[PDB]
Amino acid sequence: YALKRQG
Amino acid sequence: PSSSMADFRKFFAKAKHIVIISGAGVSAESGVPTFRGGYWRKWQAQDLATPLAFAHNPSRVWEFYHYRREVMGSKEPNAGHRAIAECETRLGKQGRRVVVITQNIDELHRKAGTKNLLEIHGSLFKTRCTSCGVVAENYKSPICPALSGKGAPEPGTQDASIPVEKLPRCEEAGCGGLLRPHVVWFGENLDPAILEEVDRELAHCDLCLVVGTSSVVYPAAMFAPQVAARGVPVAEFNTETTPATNRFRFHFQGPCGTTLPEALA
Ligand SMILES: [Zn+2]
Numbered sequence: 615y616a617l618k619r620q621g
Numbered sequence: 622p623s624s625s626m627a628d629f630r631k632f633f634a635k636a637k638h639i640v641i642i643s644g645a646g647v648s649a650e651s652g653v654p655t656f657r658g659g660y661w662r663k664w665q666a667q668d669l670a671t672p673l674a675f676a677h678n679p680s681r682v683w684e685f686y687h688y689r690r691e692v693m694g695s696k697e698p699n700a701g702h703r704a705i706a707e708c709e710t711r712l713g714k715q716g717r718r719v720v721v722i723t724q725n726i727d728e729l730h731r732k733a734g735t736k737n738l739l740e741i742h743g744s745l746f747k748t749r750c751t752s753c754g755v756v757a758e759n760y761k762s763p764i765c766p767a768l769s770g771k772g773a774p775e776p777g778t779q780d781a782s783i784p785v786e787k788l789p790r791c792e793e794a795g796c797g798g799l800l801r802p803h804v805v806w807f808g809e810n811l812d813p814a815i816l817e818e819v820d821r822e823l824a825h826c827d828l829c830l831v832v833g834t835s836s837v838v839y840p841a842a843m844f845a846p847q848v849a850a851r852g853v854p855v856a857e858f859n860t861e862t863t864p865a866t867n868r869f870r871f872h873f874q875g876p877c878g879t880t881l882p883e884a885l886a
Contacts, residue, residue: 615840616810616811616813616816616840617808617809617810617839617840618742618805618806618807618808618809618810618811618838618839618840619807619808619838619839620667620807620837620838620839621837621839
């Protein structure tokens with residue numbers, strides 16, 4: 615949820 | 622997803638809590654390079670905005686951010702930035718709330734007038750000490766001496782390889798710790814204080830606008846879809862359709878520079 619990530 | 626402005630303006634005149642989510646699309650209209658695909662030397666933001674990149678090559682990462690910091694000096698807010706800031710002042714006076722939640726780190730929303738600003742990814746112009754954790758505003762150019770005349774974006778430029786001892790150091794008495802940019806990198810979490818401000822804004826939201834976002838960076842990408850799922854209308858203003866657009870009431874295409882001044886009039 616809080617994790618920055620791409621996709 | 623409708624392309625009708627008249628229908629938008631009907632929700633717009635009534636809405637009392639309006640949340641605006643802003644993405645790199647808005648800064649690119651000021652000529653700010655969003656390195657999201659374009660490159661700094663042989664890299665994009667995704668390759669350098671990571672804790673690993675900083676651990677292995679902190680010199681390189683600081684060069685990059687240094688570049689980005691210096692480039693902002695010439696840059697100014699655009700018609701999209703201004704329209705959003707005016708709207709917030711105007712609606713403030715009618716007992717109506719407007720909040721901007723930005724994925725951007727360039728502070729162009731601040732320069733434009735926006736008060737209710739949540740910078741979910743941090744800022745270019747704040748550092749954080751990796752020894753003591755103090756977060757400090759820093760606008761100094763260059764941020765440190767060993768970075769003067771570094772950070773060229775042209776590929777082939779050799780790495781300055783500044784020893785860690787000469788990259789920005791904490792100025793707190795007694796610390797000497799290595800600073801990093803106070804930006805949220807890929808692989809890291811958003812600040813919990815920031816996430817609660819957002820949770821509340823998204824919950825009691827009224828009308829949501831999503832402007833110049835490609836909708837491929839999480840969690841920011843889930844924020845408008847959250848709101849739409851609650852039966853709340855969402856207008857997407859973007860030059861080109863996204864993987865989330867089909868979940869939104871409206872899509873208006875164009876530069877947010879062209880479309881927002883009308884939408885928010
Ligand atoms: Zn420190």
